[PDB]
Amino acid sequence: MRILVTNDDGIYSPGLWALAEAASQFGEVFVAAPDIAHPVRAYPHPSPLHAPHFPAYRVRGTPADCVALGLHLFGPVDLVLSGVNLGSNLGHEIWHSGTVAAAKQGYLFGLSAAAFSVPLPDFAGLRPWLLRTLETLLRLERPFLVNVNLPLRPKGFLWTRQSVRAYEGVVIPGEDPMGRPFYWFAPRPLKEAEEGTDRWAVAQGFVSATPLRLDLTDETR
Template identity: 80%
Template sequence: MRILVTNDDGIFSPGIWTLAQAASQFGEVLVVAPDVEQSGVGHAISIAHPVRAYPHPSPLPTPHFPAYRVRGTPADCVALGLHLFGPVDLVLSGVNLGSNLGNEIWHSGTVAAAKQGRLFGLSAAAFSTPTNGEGLEFEALRPWIERVIQNLLRLERPFLVNVNLPHRPRGFLWTRQSVRSYEGVVVEGKDPMGRPLYWFAARPLMEAEEGTDRWAVEQGFVAATPLRLDLTDEAKLQPDLAHD
């Protein structure tokens, strides 16, 4: 099995190398990732300028993975990785430094990279873990990442799955996406020159429902959420439109 590993935090993030090590238990691993952090870029692709790629040395003594750092988006990295390395069987994205739960998947570059793999007809999964920048031990998560990959490989292919891992998992759950309302917040401040600047944030207006990805992670479970590319709201599809 050939596995393409990418992320949106950039090739220098420790999460991508933990994912690559875990994936190496299941096949040949190829790493292609942005040269700088691309968090929150969603499914952006580069069409107005060329994309550059540079060979990148693996920081791991063993196993050795061929790798490239790319001046482009996470979705670019998947498209270019497939061009550089040829056919692969599985695309894995992450492990992201920060959750991608519920509504966060709409703007997540991590999930978009997996989605790009699925758009190419491949099986794909995104991996994320909540973090405040302290106390995160990727090595402790690696056995859980391997267990998740084992579970994914039992699915009918092709698949697209969003995976979120708490720091100390106590189990694994299949979940649905949390869709809860938020209140938009704009926090105003000033830069060192006294010029106004703005931070965009959001506050949830309700608790996460049981059985959702956010609820599962809050309870200490690995949350695996199957996704699909078709965003059509079937319940609101009018019969006359359906036959056009």
């Protein structure tokens, strides 16, 4: 099978290549990553030095643009991967993240897809977990759409649901050196993450894998 790999950190991020090398084990892989009708420019790009080779393009555009372009430039691909993104994509942030958006883009086109994030990393120690998460996802009924969060050093794997905690708008008064007054604003979650949630799995050293839907519509309502 043919896999397109992208990210939202860019063509020079190590996470990107960690994900690509991990993917190369299961299929031929191609890379397209950033460097209303809108224009999009892509340019051929050399893969990292001593790493395995990978046809690739640096794209002046969004992660989603990278997916549409990648599918157009790299012919027929069967799977879209996004990551490994540097930072975390847990709970509420998964619905306003460019990392989740590219995977969604892939799924909108009819392909299985998945996002990889790691709340901050050593990709040498994660390689095997990337490999093992990848072979798990590949047994799912296709097509699939999954958001994967890996802890720095995972000790397991759990299917999860997004943590939907409520927050408190903590707002404390302050002033900077020049005397000027201002207000500190720091949203704070109201409760510690619940068991079964991505955040709970991650905080416990478990790779978190969350099946996603395409939108936020409250159809029950």
